[PDB]
Known about the structure:
TIM Barrel, aldolase, eight-stranded parallel β-sheet, 11 strands, beta barrel, homotetramer, 358 residues, globular, two-stranded antiparallel sheet, alpha/beta, lyase, leishmania
Amino acid sequence: MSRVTVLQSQLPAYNRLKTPYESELIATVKKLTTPGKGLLAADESIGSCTKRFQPIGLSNTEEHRRQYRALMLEAEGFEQYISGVILHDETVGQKASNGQTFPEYLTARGVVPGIKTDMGLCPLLEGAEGEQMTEGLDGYVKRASAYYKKGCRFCKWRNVYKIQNGTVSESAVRFNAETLARYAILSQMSGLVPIVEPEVMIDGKHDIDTCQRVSEHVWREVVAALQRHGVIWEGCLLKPNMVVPGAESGKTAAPEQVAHYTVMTLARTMPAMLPGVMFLSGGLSEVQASEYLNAINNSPLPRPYFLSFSYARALQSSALKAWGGKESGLAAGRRAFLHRARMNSMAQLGKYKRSDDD
Amino acid sequence: MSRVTVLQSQLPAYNRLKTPYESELIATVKKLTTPGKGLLAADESIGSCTKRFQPIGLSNTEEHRRQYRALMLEAEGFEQYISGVILHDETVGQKASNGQTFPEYLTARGVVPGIKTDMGLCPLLEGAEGEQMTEGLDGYVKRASAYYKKGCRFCKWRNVYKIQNGTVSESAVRFNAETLARYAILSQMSGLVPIVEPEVMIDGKHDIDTCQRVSEHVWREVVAALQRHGVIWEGCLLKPNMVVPGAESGKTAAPEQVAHYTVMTLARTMPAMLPGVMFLSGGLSEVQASEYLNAINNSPLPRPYFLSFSYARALQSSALKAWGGKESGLAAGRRAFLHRARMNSMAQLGKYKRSDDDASSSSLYV
Amino acid sequence: MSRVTVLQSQLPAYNRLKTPYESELIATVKKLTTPGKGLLAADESIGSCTKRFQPIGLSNTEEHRRQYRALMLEAEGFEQYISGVILHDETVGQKASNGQTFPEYLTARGVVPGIKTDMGLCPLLEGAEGEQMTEGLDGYVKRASAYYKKGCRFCKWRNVYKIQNGTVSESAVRFNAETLARYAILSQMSGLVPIVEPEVMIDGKHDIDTCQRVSEHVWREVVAALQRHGVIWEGCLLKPNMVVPGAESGKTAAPEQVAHYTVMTLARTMPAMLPGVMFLSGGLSEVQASEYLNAINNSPLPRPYFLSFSYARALQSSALKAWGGKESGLAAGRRAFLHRARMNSMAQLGKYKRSDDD
Amino acid sequence: MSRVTVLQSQLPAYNRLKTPYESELIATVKKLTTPGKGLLAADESIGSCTKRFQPIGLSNTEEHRRQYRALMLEAEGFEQYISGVILHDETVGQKASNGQTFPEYLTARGVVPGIKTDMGLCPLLEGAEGEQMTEGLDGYVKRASAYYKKGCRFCKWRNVYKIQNGTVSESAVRFNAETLARYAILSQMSGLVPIVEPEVMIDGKHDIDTCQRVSEHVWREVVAALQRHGVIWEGCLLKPNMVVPGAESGKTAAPEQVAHYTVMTLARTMPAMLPGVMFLSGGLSEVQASEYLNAINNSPLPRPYFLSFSYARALQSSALKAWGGKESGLAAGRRAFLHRARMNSMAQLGKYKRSDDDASSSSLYV
């Protein structure tokens, strides 16, 4: 009949992302999936800092925020457990004690610097009341390229799903997945390894089975969106929630159960090629965070991906307390921080022991 | 087996957008789809104004751009042909010669004020080279609420599709449709009637048949995304390209043909509920735009929606020359303008007579 | 730039069906949308026939079902209100008293012979209990071609949707839409104008608003699938349910309300090119069918498509009661039939007068 | 703010197939994924027996066909390699010398009996010329349950995709994916472990990269369709083609390139929960099928799934020539079969020695 001459890039099967940064994104992924190491999330918003600086009588100020990061980033020895640090936009431009910017300081000390690139949560305006979307795509490439030049080699974007009445709307399921996928593509085009975070929040009275179903449903659509946008699989990371019961369920779960549900859900949704899964703690206690990761790393279920951590609260709670926002507490805070970082390092190895936590 | 109580809004079938502005949106649509009337698109970018000031040798200054609009906005008796005006961000805050802002001015003249809310084209970064997406969704509701407060009651957002080698990438077909749909929802939530502009550009060597295929393909996906986002069909409008031969195809279609193809492609993709289709001139001459629109309004094919215009170039090029960017040219400028306005008003009614119009008209394709 | 020559048919934008039957299909559609006329649905299964021969004491036999169709068809002057007849596989091969096969008998009188091509409902085996799918796609072209050679020029296929708890499963919504879509394509490739019947059943306690929501949700997905499979819009017809309250809701809707909801739903989902909509009576009484249709043809809402009927019950009820299965009842049975046919004919024209049914 | 009580099963997140055979389907998967064991494919259509007996000159009859199967199904000591057999319809009814039907036989010999349940390729009638669909979904459960009663515990259905001009149409990518996904659900509900066969045919002059792209594209949709239909991943298998250059490509890929390209394309589209991948020969020589598998099983790339085989030709070819059809050739016949089966069992374990096979293996392509 008729035959036409078209651009190979106009054919569906040739939608894979093409970027001269590919080789580098994979080298970064390799650095981020180093046995016994995980990511330190230090990207808290100025508003979230307030919720940290308040219980220690620390005025939430620009200088005190730098000290809060410094407490951890300049805790010589944490590099052994932390392969990457997700930085807040403010911190990327702050200097360490030696005059080096934090990205320079971390790089020079063998730690990959990362950056939170989303612009915050907003009402979905579709679906159910309470559901939220995430802004940030407009002017993303310009923002990311600037972070790249400053030293960052990976980034993080977070979308949230809120389980209400044992389910979540399709509007939320579809839209937030498309947001995450587009975000990952623009990230790779900018030379930044994207950490895709589709967090099914722990808030609510639902049980672990409900979390499992919603987690699976939410995650599979995220993967489809990713396939749809031609993401380079070997160049990205997933930062999901573990599958556990809700904070108001009054019910708790055993390390092995969480491991079974979490590993099984990832396996049923994620492509074997996905390089790593750096869990978020969000809601779980410091100890549970390590107990669960440890169990996950002992799971008999299939899991080709590196299973580690991307914690904020779980690595900081005890540290901030001992620290107390005071220079005379840096020693204690860093001791507490290194201990938590070490416990999780061993959890990634599956060699964690509750005994080491008293 | 097991039962559970969920919010009705969590069920797929109950995804229609909920806004307190519904009534007002529908009323606006009704005003914007008045027989014999069309929309004037005067939302060009500062950068786009420079290209228009070239023929007349005018300096692209803020004040000159104000006069450029006032030239048309303050043209006595234009409301007989114009039901709404798409304003540029800047013009929204500028005053008319009587002191009130253009939105206040237009509103008093019974003309609905509109605003171009998209933030421009950017490389798609997926699909084929040359394809572009449109930014502007971030912080959208905020900007839209402010416009609503100033008087605007409708808006316009444009996505473009470039026919290359007789096709467009799926990455572009899906993504831009999705952007348009999300935009329609945020606009309606903000109280602004959204004019969705999915433009298959006239750029290329492609023929009317290829433009027909791509248009049907590009538009049906726009419709799919709108249904997924639960757009209020009764409260939105479409601003599509007419289906015609590529600017470099070397061919030119007859009104009857353009009418057939355009109306055929709309009917095959658009829900019969869609209130109206306000065509873009997109490069056609002033006369072509009126000829084609007239034929469209005389088509024996299915077309339940109000079919009119939303022209920029096809309504200004002549009035612009006559004007000459001088004060002395206003009378001449406004006569030309009001003439094309009258012509398109006639074409909308399908009672356009090529006699009462110019015997010649040069291409406007940039 | 890396180009490649491919078949135009391998490109997404070029998926519109290609069949030599086009013009004929459009001619048939033209016939089926003759103002003042509608379709007589006479394709009741053997099982459904038993349900009607019961209240008149007629043994459900081949010869008796033939007579059942003969009552309607051999009614002189019916071609005045009926443009097409949906036949049952059995009838296609049966003969009217003059020796002509029913298809030959219809054609001769200017009435298009139609055929029910689906193979019945079966459990969906996905989604919720009570949901059903429709079999019949395997070996479809062979079957359709055989019917074509027998005089049939159009066909019908029915998929159902059961509202339960004010909703229906996405499994049901997606699968049945895909089924109808494939059906339409195969039919047109065989020379038969497909009458797509996506029926949201009246059964249930739901109210008119629930029917409106589900109908719109169900219908738009049928549309979406028809586009994916590249149906020839100019050559197909829709046989939907009217939007009305559930049969067991204990509520009633005024003809004007039914017209408003029904016309509003079709408009929000059906593309403007759709040729016609021939409503099913299913559940509605003989008069309601007429009243509602009439109200619909007086709706001030957008409706570019021919809005008529495709009734079985609403056209045969009273006729059957008068026929009683007796040869001595043909006169009255037939009078009863033409009456109803005429009423709906006027309804199609929006000139129905209730007094004519008093 | 309105709330409604619905069946949990009407919510999108709860579409996972619910069946009482789950535990069993999984047990069957355990057996079909036994270390060092692959799958024998003796389900060639009757018409395919004539298209394989010609060279060896053997009359095609129910009895001789029974012997064709008897050859290997009765070959002593094949149960250390072949963990399952995909039988043809007819072969399910036939009996083994001992009197027991093949299914009954195999079960006794530990070998799991399976059945080809699809009903052949047909014109897709959508998309590009040459593309094909696969029939058999109508009345499927009825057929499956009959097979279950006779002892069958798994089944196979195969859809094909033709690379033409280096591509395939979405019409095909979408339709065959939905067919396969539906087939999987109906199989599991019928107690049969489904082996999904999304085969990208080796026909054509396309190079390896083009097969990599298409295969990744085709398999993407299969997985997507499977997620929509709610398949029990722990209870199914995939029988895909290897990513090799076209038959008329005028090339040949080394066992290293074939492994890389193949294991990479699987990891990029298959859920990490997929139990196993039983490859097909498609047209590769009896040795390549063993080399490639072996290499595939020596890939450093991620692959949590059991990577084995489900061969026919590359497992019968020789065992066929050295049989002719007489009971005399039951020596050389069963001599060859048990060899090829021994090689693949090695390859499965990644410890296959090419020095063990012949240096003259022609293509089994047709």
